[PDB]
Copies of this chain bind each other. A is one copy, B any other.
């Protein structure tokens, strides 16, 4: 196409010894053969600049898991091609002009034993570096045993090895149990993506450093995470629009010295935000929280098994700043668990030194804006409700009621 052997068009690649195989019939095999060509020509630690794999708009079945074990590989389409399969599966589509996602459209038809469409994994040194996924659709096609299970065992992109300077951007994920998993992320960017109608959206597993999750649209399933981070340091979550219906919208476990700022959070279940298992010194600020109830008939009765005393925020850690957030709670009294209970907006489950400052709460019912567990120590609650909206079972909580 261009005068480099490092620029690949998947619709122009012939696999030697498998001439009938196309990008349409199995783009996985085609890209595995492309990665082989790259490894045959890039034969030394000083001749490995990587390459780019172009995916034109079109419908491509992936049957073979692609293994990405080369630094500086870029896989690029020209469109995220997102489509609400969830609405399609549940409504009368008679006269509908389109019935599936498109753009640079990869349908994930992987074997159960290698379920992930893209497995980024290198045994050895150094960390895989500078890999870029952008501007194409990853479509799991269907959920089993019906379209509403948010279950099918398929993953879009799974980074298994310690990685450095990976960039995921302009992607479309639909109808995967797991859209994107990154283990061992240093200097990762997950930026300006459409990740919706997946069991789980973005999983930052193991540990991580200096990562940005920015400017994304995300919506997961009732038994799954929207954003999760395990043992992350200086993770920045900014500019994201988290909508339903994951078990949670944000979930840190053992995360310290991260920041969640200028996001929008709409949840249909309690525990939209969870800082778990001792999260220290985290900034949770300039965020809009909205706790509503399911309006899509097919999901009216599905729940995450948590009651309205769980918190919209549930926080177990030291020295977090939960400040300048708006909480708009609207749940029909007959859909609140337990019956007759006041919903808790912010629950400090435990930890030393946490500060709740400058928070506005609206509810359709009498709610406790802040409940502090008895185990909370040296906690401060400032201008986050009248005195009747603050419950401190901890006897050392300094409270300034909103005047």
The answer to whether B323 and A324 touch across the interface, beta carbons within 8 angstroms, is yes
| Neighbouring B residues of A261 by C-beta, 8 Å | 261-262, 286
| Complex Cα gap A403–B380 (Å) | 7
A residues 90-129 touching B (CB-CB < 8 Å): 93, 95-105, 122, 124-126, 129
A interface residue count range (under 10 / 10 to 19 / 20 to 34 / 35 or more): 35 or more
Q: Is the interface of A mostly helix, strand, loop or mixed?
A: loop
Kindly state whether residue A264 has any CB partner on chain B within 8 Å: yes
Determine the distance from Cα of A81 to Cα of B52 in the docked complex, in whole angstroms. Answer: 11
Given contacts A125-B97, A211-B241, A239-B215, contact A288 B234 (CB under 8 A): yes
By beta carbon, the residue of chain B nearest A164 is B84
CA distance A115 to B215 in the complex (A): 32
Q: Chain copies in the assembly?
A: 3
Specify which chain B residues have a CB less than 8 angstroms from the CB of A89 in the assembled complex.
none
- A400 located at the interface, meaning its Cβ lies under 8 Å from any Cβ of chain B in the complex: yes
Of B47, B98, B257, which is within 8 A of A290 by CB?
B257
Distance, CA A167 to CA B169, complexed state (A):
12
Cα-based distance from A259 to B261 in the complex (angstroms): 11
Q: Are A56 and B7 in contact (CB under 8 A)?
A: yes
Contact across chains for B102 and A56 when beta carbons are under 8 A apart: no
A189 and B192: CB pair below 8 A? yes
Partner of A236, one of B73, B81, B259, B288: B288
Interfacial chain B residues near A209, Cβ < 8 Å: 243
- Contact yes or no, A262 B241, CB < 8 A: no
